[PDB]
Protein backbone atom coordinates (compact mmCIF):
# COMPACT_ATOMS: atom_id res chain seq x y z
CA UNK A 1 0.00 0.00 0.00
CA UNK A 2 3.03 2.25 0.59
CA UNK A 3 6.83 1.90 0.43
CA UNK A 4 8.43 0.55 3.60
CA UNK A 5 11.89 1.44 4.94
CA UNK A 6 14.59 -1.20 4.56
CA UNK A 7 17.06 -1.39 7.45
CA UNK A 8 20.02 -3.72 7.74
CA UNK A 9 22.37 -4.35 10.65
CA UNK A 10 25.95 -5.62 10.68
CA UNK A 11 25.85 -8.58 13.07
CA UNK A 12 29.56 -8.04 13.76
CA UNK A 13 29.40 -4.39 14.89
CA UNK A 14 25.69 -4.00 15.63
CA UNK A 15 25.53 -0.91 13.41
CA UNK A 16 22.36 -0.35 11.38
CA UNK A 17 21.37 1.99 8.55
CA UNK A 18 18.64 2.59 5.99
CA UNK A 19 18.90 1.66 2.31
CA UNK B 1 -0.95 -11.25 9.77
CA UNK B 2 -2.81 -8.20 8.49
CA UNK B 3 -0.35 -5.32 8.50
CA UNK B 4 2.84 -7.35 7.98
CA UNK B 5 3.39 -5.84 4.53
CA UNK B 6 3.15 -2.31 6.00
CA UNK B 7 6.06 -2.97 8.40
CA UNK B 8 9.68 -1.93 7.89
CA UNK B 9 12.04 -4.60 6.60
CA UNK B 10 15.00 -5.61 8.78
CA UNK B 11 18.02 -7.55 7.50
CA UNK B 12 20.87 -8.94 9.60
CA UNK B 13 23.94 -10.77 8.29
CA UNK B 14 27.63 -11.40 8.87
CA UNK B 15 28.80 -9.69 5.65
CA UNK B 16 27.31 -6.84 3.59
CA UNK B 17 28.47 -5.40 0.28
CA UNK B 18 27.19 -2.75 -2.12
CA UNK B 19 27.84 -2.47 -5.84
CA UNK B 20 29.31 0.74 -7.24
CA UNK B 21 26.18 2.00 -9.02
CA UNK B 22 24.38 1.60 -5.69
CA UNK B 23 21.10 -0.20 -6.46
CA UNK B 24 22.12 -3.73 -5.35
CA UNK B 25 23.10 -4.82 -1.84
CA UNK B 26 24.30 -8.35 -1.05
CA UNK B 27 24.14 -9.96 2.39
CA UNK B 28 25.94 -13.20 3.22
CA UNK B 29 26.38 -15.31 6.33
CA UNK B 30 23.33 -16.41 8.35
CA UNK B 31 21.01 -13.78 6.88
CA UNK B 32 17.74 -13.05 8.68
CA UNK B 33 15.04 -10.97 6.92
CA UNK B 34 12.04 -9.90 9.01
CA UNK B 35 8.90 -7.89 8.23
CA UNK B 36 6.27 -8.08 10.94
CA UNK B 37 5.83 -11.80 11.57
CA UNK B 38 7.48 -12.72 8.24
CA UNK B 39 10.91 -14.29 8.72
CA UNK B 40 13.26 -15.48 5.97
CA UNK B 41 16.55 -17.26 6.71
CA UNK B 42 19.16 -17.68 3.98
CA UNK B 43 22.89 -17.91 3.37
CA UNK B 44 22.85 -15.09 0.79
CA UNK B 45 20.27 -12.36 0.22
CA UNK B 46 20.32 -9.90 -2.69
CA UNK B 47 18.13 -6.80 -2.45
CA UNK B 48 17.56 -4.96 -5.73
CA UNK B 49 15.81 -1.59 -5.96
CA UNK B 50 15.46 -1.39 -9.77
CA UNK B 51 15.70 2.22 -10.91
CA UNK B 52 15.84 3.53 -7.35
CA UNK B 53 12.06 3.78 -6.98
CA UNK B 54 10.99 3.19 -3.39
CA UNK B 55 8.42 0.41 -3.10
CA UNK B 56 9.69 -1.68 -6.04
CA UNK B 57 12.43 -3.49 -4.11
CA UNK B 58 13.06 -7.18 -4.84
CA UNK B 59 14.42 -9.55 -2.18
CA UNK B 60 16.16 -12.75 -3.29
CA UNK B 61 17.36 -15.29 -0.74
CA UNK B 62 19.42 -18.44 -1.31
CA UNK B 63 20.16 -21.26 1.10
CA UNK B 64 20.38 -25.03 1.47
CA UNK B 65 17.55 -24.65 2.11
CA UNK B 66 16.43 -21.08 2.66
CA UNK B 67 13.49 -20.94 5.07
CA UNK B 68 10.28 -18.94 5.35
CA UNK B 69 7.95 -18.21 8.27
CA UNK B 70 4.80 -16.15 8.77
CA UNK B 71 1.99 -16.11 11.30
CA UNK B 72 -1.52 -16.01 9.81
CA UNK B 73 -4.60 -14.16 11.06
CA UNK B 74 -6.31 -17.46 11.85
CA UNK B 75 -3.51 -18.07 14.39
CA UNK B 76 -1.83 -20.89 12.46
CA UNK B 77 1.81 -20.30 11.47
CA UNK B 78 3.04 -21.09 7.95
CA UNK B 79 6.57 -22.45 7.45
CA UNK B 80 8.46 -23.49 4.35
CA UNK B 81 11.84 -24.06 2.80
CA UNK B 82 13.36 -24.05 -0.68
CA UNK B 83 16.64 -23.31 -2.43
CA UNK B 84 15.43 -19.81 -3.32
CA UNK B 85 13.13 -17.20 -1.80
CA UNK B 86 11.73 -14.52 -4.12
CA UNK B 87 9.85 -11.60 -2.55
CA UNK B 88 8.77 -8.62 -4.65
CA UNK B 89 7.54 -5.92 -2.27
CA UNK B 90 5.06 -4.51 -4.79
CA UNK B 91 3.35 -7.90 -5.06
CA UNK B 92 1.60 -9.56 -2.12
CA UNK B 93 3.26 -12.99 -2.29
CA UNK B 94 6.58 -14.82 -2.11
CA UNK B 95 7.89 -17.53 -4.44
CA UNK B 96 9.66 -20.67 -3.23
CA UNK B 97 11.75 -22.38 -5.92
CA UNK B 98 13.77 -25.58 -5.81
CA UNK B 99 12.64 -28.52 -3.65
CA UNK B 100 9.98 -26.18 -2.30
CA UNK B 101 7.88 -27.18 0.71
CA UNK B 102 5.18 -25.41 2.73
CA UNK B 103 3.32 -26.39 5.90
CA UNK B 104 0.71 -25.06 8.31
CA UNK B 105 0.88 -25.55 12.09
CA UNK B 106 -2.30 -26.07 14.11
CA UNK B 107 -0.81 -26.49 17.60
CA UNK B 108 2.36 -25.58 19.48
CA UNK B 109 3.79 -25.32 22.99
CA UNK B 110 6.75 -23.42 24.45
CA UNK B 111 8.62 -23.57 27.72
CA UNK B 112 11.93 -24.11 29.45
CA UNK B 113 11.30 -27.88 29.52
CA UNK B 114 8.89 -29.87 27.34
CA UNK B 115 8.20 -33.59 27.81
CA UNK B 116 6.74 -35.39 24.80
CA UNK B 117 5.46 -38.97 24.76
CA UNK B 118 6.95 -40.89 21.82
CA UNK B 119 5.22 -44.22 22.54
CA UNK B 120 1.85 -44.63 20.82
CA UNK B 121 -0.22 -47.82 20.97
CA UNK B 122 -3.13 -47.63 18.53
CA UNK B 123 -3.33 -51.44 18.59
CA UNK B 124 -2.13 -54.26 20.83
CA UNK B 125 -1.70 -57.98 20.09
CA UNK B 126 -1.93 -60.70 22.75
CA UNK B 127 -0.90 -64.30 22.12
CA UNK C 1 3.74 -43.94 15.02
CA UNK C 2 2.89 -47.19 16.78
CA UNK C 3 5.98 -49.40 16.85
CA UNK C 4 8.60 -46.63 16.55
CA UNK C 5 10.17 -47.41 19.93
CA UNK C 6 10.57 -51.07 18.88
CA UNK C 7 12.79 -50.13 15.92
CA UNK C 8 16.59 -50.09 15.80
CA UNK C 9 18.32 -46.79 16.54
CA UNK C 10 20.59 -45.51 13.77
CA UNK C 11 23.15 -42.72 14.26
CA UNK C 12 25.10 -40.94 11.51
CA UNK C 13 27.82 -38.39 12.27
CA UNK C 14 31.04 -36.83 11.03
CA UNK C 15 33.15 -37.95 14.03
CA UNK C 16 32.77 -40.66 16.68
CA UNK C 17 34.63 -40.92 20.01
CA UNK C 18 34.34 -44.32 21.70
CA UNK C 19 35.06 -44.24 25.42
CA UNK C 20 37.39 -47.15 26.02
CA UNK C 21 35.27 -48.64 28.81
CA UNK C 22 32.69 -49.35 26.10
CA UNK C 23 29.64 -47.79 27.78
CA UNK C 24 29.80 -44.28 26.23
CA UNK C 25 30.01 -43.18 22.58
CA UNK C 26 30.16 -39.50 21.62
CA UNK C 27 29.09 -38.26 18.17
CA UNK C 28 29.75 -34.82 16.72
CA UNK C 29 29.21 -33.06 13.41
CA UNK C 30 25.76 -33.12 11.77
CA UNK C 31 24.52 -36.01 13.89
CA UNK C 32 21.31 -37.73 12.80
CA UNK C 33 19.55 -40.19 15.13
CA UNK C 34 16.65 -42.13 13.63
CA UNK C 35 14.31 -44.71 15.15
CA UNK C 36 11.43 -45.50 12.82
CA UNK C 37 9.87 -42.12 12.07
CA UNK C 38 11.63 -40.46 15.03
CA UNK C 39 14.47 -38.21 13.91
CA UNK C 40 16.86 -36.12 16.04
CA UNK C 41 19.41 -33.67 14.59
CA UNK C 42 22.15 -32.26 16.80
CA UNK C 43 25.71 -30.96 16.67
CA UNK C 44 26.65 -33.35 19.50
CA UNK C 45 25.08 -36.60 20.70
CA UNK C 46 26.24 -38.65 23.69
CA UNK C 47 24.93 -42.20 24.14
CA UNK C 48 25.45 -43.71 27.59
CA UNK C 49 24.71 -47.28 28.68
CA UNK C 50 25.00 -47.06 32.49
CA UNK C 51 26.48 -50.26 33.85
CA UNK C 52 26.48 -52.03 30.49
CA UNK C 53 22.78 -52.82 31.04
CA UNK C 54 21.01 -53.14 27.69
CA UNK C 55 17.72 -51.30 27.32
CA UNK C 56 18.87 -48.62 29.77
CA UNK C 57 20.72 -46.51 27.20
CA UNK C 58 20.35 -42.72 27.36
CA UNK C 59 20.60 -40.50 24.28
CA UNK C 60 21.54 -36.86 24.84
CA UNK C 61 21.67 -34.41 21.94
CA UNK C 62 22.92 -30.82 21.96
CA UNK C 63 22.60 -28.14 19.30
CA UNK C 64 21.73 -24.48 18.74
CA UNK C 65 19.12 -25.70 18.46
CA UNK C 66 18.84 -29.46 18.14
CA UNK C 67 15.71 -30.60 16.31
CA UNK C 68 13.17 -33.40 16.71
CA UNK C 69 10.64 -34.98 14.34
CA UNK C 70 8.10 -37.80 14.52
CA UNK C 71 5.09 -38.92 12.52
CA UNK C 72 1.99 -39.59 14.60
CA UNK C 73 -0.61 -42.31 14.11
CA UNK C 74 -3.09 -39.57 13.18
CA UNK C 75 -0.94 -38.53 10.20
CA UNK C 76 0.11 -35.17 11.69
CA UNK C 77 3.88 -34.73 12.13
CA UNK C 78 5.31 -33.38 15.38
CA UNK C 79 8.34 -31.07 15.26
CA UNK C 80 10.38 -29.41 17.97
CA UNK C 81 13.65 -27.78 18.85
CA UNK C 82 15.63 -27.12 22.02
CA UNK C 83 19.20 -26.69 23.21
CA UNK C 84 19.17 -30.27 24.55
CA UNK C 85 17.33 -33.48 23.65
CA UNK C 86 17.14 -36.14 26.37
CA UNK C 87 15.75 -39.55 25.34
CA UNK C 88 15.85 -42.50 27.75
CA UNK C 89 15.02 -45.70 25.87
CA UNK C 90 13.56 -47.39 28.97
CA UNK C 91 11.11 -44.50 29.25
CA UNK C 92 8.47 -43.57 26.68
CA UNK C 93 9.28 -39.88 26.29
CA UNK C 94 11.84 -37.33 25.14
CA UNK C 95 12.67 -34.19 27.13
CA UNK C 96 13.37 -30.83 25.47
CA UNK C 97 15.27 -28.32 27.62
CA UNK C 98 16.44 -24.77 26.99
CA UNK C 99 14.33 -22.65 24.62
CA UNK C 100 12.07 -25.66 24.11
CA UNK C 101 9.47 -25.50 21.34
CA UNK C 102 7.11 -28.17 20.01
CA UNK C 103 4.49 -28.02 17.25
CA UNK C 104 2.03 -30.13 15.26
CA UNK C 105 1.53 -29.81 11.49
CA UNK C 106 -1.97 -30.21 10.03
CA UNK C 107 -1.29 -29.59 6.31
CA UNK C 108 1.63 -29.44 3.90
CA UNK C 109 2.58 -29.50 0.23
CA UNK C 110 5.70 -30.02 -1.89
CA UNK C 111 6.71 -28.85 -5.34
CA UNK C 112 9.36 -27.29 -7.53
CA UNK C 113 7.69 -23.87 -7.26
CA UNK C 114 5.29 -22.63 -4.57
CA UNK C 115 3.64 -19.22 -4.35
CA UNK C 116 2.16 -18.02 -1.06
CA UNK C 117 0.26 -14.81 -0.31
CA UNK C 118 1.77 -12.80 2.56
CA UNK C 119 -1.37 -10.62 2.63
CA UNK C 120 -4.74 -12.01 3.71
CA UNK C 121 -7.38 -12.37 1.01
CA UNK C 122 -10.60 -10.35 1.21
CA UNK C 123 -14.11 -11.76 0.90
CA UNK C 124 -15.28 -11.52 -2.72
CA UNK C 125 -19.05 -10.98 -2.79
CA UNK C 126 -21.39 -8.66 -4.68
CA UNK C 127 -25.15 -8.22 -4.55
CA UNK D 1 9.85 -52.93 26.24
CA UNK D 2 12.68 -54.97 24.72
CA UNK D 3 16.12 -53.41 24.15
CA UNK D 4 16.73 -52.27 20.58
CA UNK D 5 19.98 -52.46 18.57
CA UNK D 6 21.98 -49.23 18.49
CA UNK D 7 23.86 -48.92 15.18
CA UNK D 8 26.11 -45.99 14.32
CA UNK D 9 27.90 -45.36 11.03
CA UNK D 10 30.86 -43.35 9.77
CA UNK D 11 29.88 -40.87 7.07
CA UNK D 12 33.39 -40.83 5.57
CA UNK D 13 33.82 -44.62 5.31
CA UNK D 14 30.26 -45.96 5.28
CA UNK D 15 31.25 -48.44 7.99
CA UNK D 16 28.75 -49.31 10.71
CA UNK D 17 29.10 -51.05 14.05
CA UNK D 18 26.66 -52.16 16.71
CA UNK D 19 27.20 -50.35 20.01
UniProtKB/Swiss-Prot annotation, chains A, D:
One of its GO terms (biological process) is innate immune response. GO terms for cellular component: extracellular region. Keywords: Antibiotic, Antimicrobial, Disulfide bond, Fungicide, Immunity, Innate immunity, Secreted. It is found in: Secreted. It comes from the Eukaryota. The keyword Membrane does not apply. Disulfide bonds join 9-16. Insect defense peptide with a broad spectrum of activity against Gram-positive and Gram-negative bacteria and fungi. No activity against S.aureus. Stops respiration in bacteria but does not permeabilize their inner membranes. Four regions are important for the activity: the C-terminal loop, the last three C-terminal residues, the stretch of seven N-terminal residues and residues 8-9 are necessary for the antifungal activity and dispensable for antibacterial activity. This is Thanatin.
